[PDB]
Design a protein around this ligand. Structure first.
Ligand code: MG
Ligand code: MG
Ligand code: MG
Ligand code: MG
Ligand code: MG
Ligand code: MG
Ligand code: MG
Ligand code: MG
Ligand code: MG
Ligand code: MG
Ligand code: MG
Ligand code: MG
Ligand code: MG
Ligand code: MG
Ligand code: MG
Lengths: 132, 85, 101, 77, 99, 136, 194, 138
RNA sequence: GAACAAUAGUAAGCACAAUCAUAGCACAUAAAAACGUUAGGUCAAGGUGUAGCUUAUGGGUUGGAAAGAAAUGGGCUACA
């Protein structure tokens, strides 16, 4: 049985988001990719250079926003500047949210030698698509 | 070695082995205990090992009407905080 | 730290190959030609043999960036066939999808 | 944008015959160095200074190993 | 092949900057060596592995400062604390074998 | 005679961007661009807006403090144009033994400024009117 | 103390200008878009998920900053920078007579910190031999001198330069190659008599 | 009601150096999905018609890159997983442009280029003749 | 826990189906195939609970890892 990127069905009470509710064979059919760049095109290069940065960004943001992250990041790469879209639960005060976003928008830019934009959408709770 | 780390949910799922194959029919129940501890229960975000006080997380943003800079706790004060933790 | 001691040694091998890239490139010219007499080519063979072992690019092994797997690694993404699947199925890689035709 | 290659031109890259004056004109040294120059001229990955350093490396190697060229039977300087 | 044709071919190589005098394929290897960048100098080769030491040190320093929170490291620390509390810790260097 | 060749127009790198910006004026119901657009982060009062700006600046300067304290973690450059503003800064003098080189390094980087002059005068080193003006 | 602020939808004017709200590329913030958009695969009894908390909407690029009104407003201000194309070169028949030389240059853009594209060094130069002043002997010598770079049917000579690291140096080398070929096509040497 | 006044102040100057002429500008836009490419094509056509360029647009054939990997971890070769990468191309053909018009069009195109697509630019620069070929005799 | 000329069966949901891809349909192919069985394979992609090493079961250099008495599985070349 296929088990990659597949959340198993419990007795009928587990809340699952839209991204988790779809198997990997539904990519580009019902759900889109979590990241967009040019390294995965036909006549383009520098794919692993962007891939390692994507993985580092995923882990760094997961550690930076502990427990308040709703879904996975959306990493857009558009003309030397990278945008990070995140869905965050409204657990932290806005004073602490702004401190973290200001710290990140400078640390990531100085670490990757490229401008970084960070956008957060505050949700009251995790949005459930399928049974809960 | 940073990329070799995983999520705490996956770590606990593999450590407790709740979905083990031997526990399905009933071969388990020998060590009849399964406790999962949340590491982020009393973890304040701003606090760290070095005891740095950041104006946005640990200490308030404004004191005495003036802006606060980055501070560091004294060695004994940090030890007292660690003893409380 | 690094993923493994094998990857740590491979990093040193790559650094040494980059350090000695110019010397080996200059020496191999004296060996791969036929115009020059073989008398100097034989001495150039000893000169290139006296170089450190890890200086040659042949010792460089293309492993995975994530898990340092010696085999099953695509050159385009520098990742193993298992980490690549684990990321593609999660959808963190653009343009990658299950082949259906 | 941002890369000027020290303000060099096509003649500083393609034409490197001016660096082969300190070599025997009618010997096999010229036969080897013309091949080296032809290889270097078609190399967009290196600057003019690195090619000059390669030519200097060959010059000093040949001028250091003088006994072998005289023993080979061909008169070289 | 004629004497005029070989002279024309020789002049064409001289004008284009190619090899003028006749050379063997075994000798064109040294031409190609300087025509193409060596593998050990290519960026895709010499910049294959990112600085895992830098990544790990930066993440650990941020965790100690109180900006990043490493759940894997916290789990390792909790497990080591529990193991030491149980009584099976890491022996001191030099006393494991003899003592 | 029949050929017509017009002249070219030279503009600055940001001239066309300013021309495009002039097309769009300030919005009415939109929050200021610096603040996050999410309602949970949109300021409600002037004191809240000021506190949010101060918290953002404290995060930026907190990150810059770590960058300056650990320069070896940012020495790797990835961008081809090699933007210098993202590079880590150094607050240490290049030369310590030579007084003439220590004074010029310590004038631009307060407390150590007096110590540099005290060390320079310890060895009876003659100071010209240029280094002394900058020290003062 | 939790605070929940209503979004901009209740304050959006019916005739408010949209480029003012969306001037540049945005991550499609749901609070600034009054349009109720549902994206996602529907459920058997449910409906596609709304714009609030929908990751699919944030995944796709948004062209809200490139609506036709904004395109017209932006392009109107760009008329001051552009120049007028001369009407004397409407047809390529006169263009070939006036500027016979064609210069093909390749330019690439890629998302990332790097700008250097190795494919950018290649420069192509196309010249029609019917627009030059070669004589019969010079043309016959030049055809054999260039070899396969001249198309017999199209009567076009192509010079593809990639040796120089820079595009300007490649262009200078190509024009030098054209000049030297034209000059050498006229010189009759001793070995040409046999 | 509160509209700012005197909002325009550009720096535009005309130099005596003759402007560069281009015969054909080819823009090859490669992407993963067709909806983004269609929207970008509509945007480019709308932008070009305002400036009066008479752009020609056609769709080059797609390219599909498929590869195969093992389905399991340790030992299962009879079962495989095949991954596919699609690349769709759009061709924007511009003709009768000048150096400044091409520059401003490329600026307005690249400043709003999406994140998931790339663009290749090919310029056919117009030139009459160099100085040493007009009418020389050696 | 079922009798359609119907005798206790309703049923969210997961499966199947449908849909999607092989650039027009249909077909076909591909893909998918739930809960579970085989204590099935993988501590050696990677992290790991428990039990064990710390002047060693850790970390570095050099040289070797043969050979076929014999049995067998799968492919290529043929026996025209
Ligand atoms: Mg390990
Ligand atoms: Mg190897
Ligand atoms: Mg049911
Ligand atoms: Mg179909
Ligand atoms: Mg079918
Ligand atoms: Mg199958
Ligand atoms: Mg099915
Ligand atoms: Mg077993
Ligand atoms: Mg078995
Ligand atoms: Mg282990
Ligand atoms: Mg074992
Ligand atoms: Mg060994
Ligand atoms: Mg056998
Ligand atoms: Mg057979
Ligand atoms: Mg045969």
């Amino acid at each position: 049985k296929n088990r990659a990127a597949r959340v198993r069905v419990s007795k009928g009470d587990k809340p699952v988001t839209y991204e988790e509710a779809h198997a990997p064979h539904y990519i580009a059919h019902r759900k889109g990719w979590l990241s967009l760049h040019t390294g995965n095109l036909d006549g383009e290069d520098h794919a692993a250079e962007r891939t390692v940065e994507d993985v580092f960004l995923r882990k760094f943001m997961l550690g930076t926003f502990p427990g308040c992250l709703a879904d996975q990041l959306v990493l857009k790469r558009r003309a030397n500047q990278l945008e990070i879209c995140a869905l965050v639960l409204r657990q932290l005060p806005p004073h602490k949210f702004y401190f973290l976003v200001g710290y990140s928008e400078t640390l990531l830019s100085h670490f990757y030698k490229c401008p970084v934009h960070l956008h957060l959408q505050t949700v009251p709770s995790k949005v459930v698509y399928k049974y809960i | 070695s940073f990329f070799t780390k995983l999520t705490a949910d996956e770590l606990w799922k593999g450590a407790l082995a709740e979905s083990g194959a031997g526990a399905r029919k009933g071969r388990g129940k020998r060590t009849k205990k399964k406790r999962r501890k949340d590491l982020n229960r009393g973890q304040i975000i701003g606090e760290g090992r070095h005891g740095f006080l950041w104006p946005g997380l640990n200490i308030p943003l404004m004191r005495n009407g003036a802006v606060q800079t980055i501070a560091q706790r004294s060695k004994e004060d940090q030890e007292k905080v660690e003893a409380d933790m | 730290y690094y993923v493994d001691w094998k990857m740590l040694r491979d990093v040193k091998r790559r650094k040494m190959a980059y350090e000695y890239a110019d010397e080996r490139l200059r020496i191999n010219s004296l060996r791969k030609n036929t115009i020059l007499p073989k008398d100097l080519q034989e001495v150039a063979d000893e000169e290139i043999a006296s170089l450190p072992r890890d200086s040659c690019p042949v010792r460089i092994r293309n492993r995975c960036v994530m898990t340092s797997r010696p085999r099953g690694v695509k050159r385009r993404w520098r990742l193993s066939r298992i980490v690549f699947r684990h990321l593609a199925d999660h959808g963190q890689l653009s343009g990658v999808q299950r082949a259906m035709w | 944008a941002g890369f000027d290659d020290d303000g060099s031109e096509f003649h500083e890259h393609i034409f490197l015959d001016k660096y082969l004056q300190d070599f025997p004109k009618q010997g096999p040294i010229r036969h080897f160095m013309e091949l080296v120059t032809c290889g270097l001229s078609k190399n967009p990955y290196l600057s003019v200074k690195q090619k000059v350093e390669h030519i200097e490396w060959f010059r000093n190697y040949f001028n250091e190993k003088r006994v072998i060229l005289k023993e080979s039977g061909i008169q070289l300087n | 092949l004629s004497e005029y044709a070989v002279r024309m071919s020789r002049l064409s190589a001289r004008l284009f900057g190619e090899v003028a005098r006749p050379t063997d394929s075994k000798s064109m290897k040294v031409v190609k060596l300087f025509s193409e960048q060596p593998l050990a100098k290519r960026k895709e080769t010499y910049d294959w592995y990112p600085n895992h030491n830098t990544y790990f040190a930066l993440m650990g320093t941020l965790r100690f400062l109180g900006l990043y929170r490493d759940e894997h490291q916290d789990f390792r620390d909790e497990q080591l604390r529990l193991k030491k509390l149980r009584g099976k810790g890491k022996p001191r260097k030099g006393e494991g074998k003899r003592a | 005679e029949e050929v017509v060749i017009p002249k070219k127009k030279t503009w600055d790198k940001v001239a066309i961007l300013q021309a495009l910006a002039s097309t769009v004026h300030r919005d009415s119901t939109a929050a200021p661009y610096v603040f996050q657009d999410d309602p949970y982060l949109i300021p409600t009062s002037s004191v809240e807006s000021h506190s949010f700006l101060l918290a953002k600046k404290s995060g930026e300067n907190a990150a810059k403090f770590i960058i300056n304290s650990y320069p070896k973690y940012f020495q790797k450059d990835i961008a081809e144009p090699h933007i210098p503003c993202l590079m880590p800064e150094y607050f240490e003098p290049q030369i310590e033994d030579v007084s003439e080189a220590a004074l010029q390094e310590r004038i631009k980087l307060x407390x150590x400024x007096x110590x540099x002059x005290x060390x320079x005068x310890x060895x009876x080193x003659x100071x010209x009117x240029x280094x002394x003006x900058x020290x003062x | 103390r939790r605070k929940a602020l209503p979004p901009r939808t209740e304050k959006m004017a019916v005739d408010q200008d949209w480029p003012s709200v969306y001037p540049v590329a945005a991550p499609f913030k749901p609070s600034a878009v009054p349009l109720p958009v549902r994206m996602g695969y529907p459920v058997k009894r449910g409906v596609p998920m709304a714009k609030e908390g929908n990751l699919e909407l944030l995944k796709i690029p948004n062209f809200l900053h490139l609506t036709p009104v904004a395109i017209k407003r932006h392009c109107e201000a760009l008329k001051d920078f552009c120049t007028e194309w001369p009407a004397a070169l409407d047809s390529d028949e006169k263009c070939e007579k006036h500027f016979p030389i064609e210069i093909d240059t390749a330019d690439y853009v890629s998302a990332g910190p790097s700008i250097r594209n190795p494919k950018a060094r290649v420069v192509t130069l196309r010249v029609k031999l019917s627009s030059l002043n070669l004589d019969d002997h010079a043309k016959k010598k030049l055809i054999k001198l260039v070899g396969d770079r001249y198309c017999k049917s199209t009567d076009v000579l192509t010079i593809k330069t990639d040796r120089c690291p820079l595009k300007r140096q490649n262009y200078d080398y190509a024009v030098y190659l054209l000049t030297v070929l034209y000059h050498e096509s006229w010189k009759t040497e001793e070995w040409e008599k046999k | 009601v509160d509209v700012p006044k005197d909002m325009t102040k550009p720096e535009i100057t005309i130099s005596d150096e003759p402007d560069t002429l281009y015969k054909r500008l080819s823009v090859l836009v490669k992407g993963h999905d067709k909806a983004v490419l269609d929207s970008y094509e509509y945007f480019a056509v709308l932008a070009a018609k305002e400036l009066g360029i008479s752009i020609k647009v056609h769709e080059p054939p797609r390219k599909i890159e498929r590869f195969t990997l093992l389905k399991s971890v340790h030992i299962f070769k009879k079962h495989r997983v095949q991954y596919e990468m699609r690349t769709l191309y759009r061709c924007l053909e511009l003709e009768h442009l000048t150096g400044s018009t091409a520059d401003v069009y490329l600026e307005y195109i690249q400043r709003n280029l999406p994140e998931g697509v790339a663009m290749e630019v090919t310029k056919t620069k117009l030139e009459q003749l160099p100085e040493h070929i007009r009418k020389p005799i050696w």
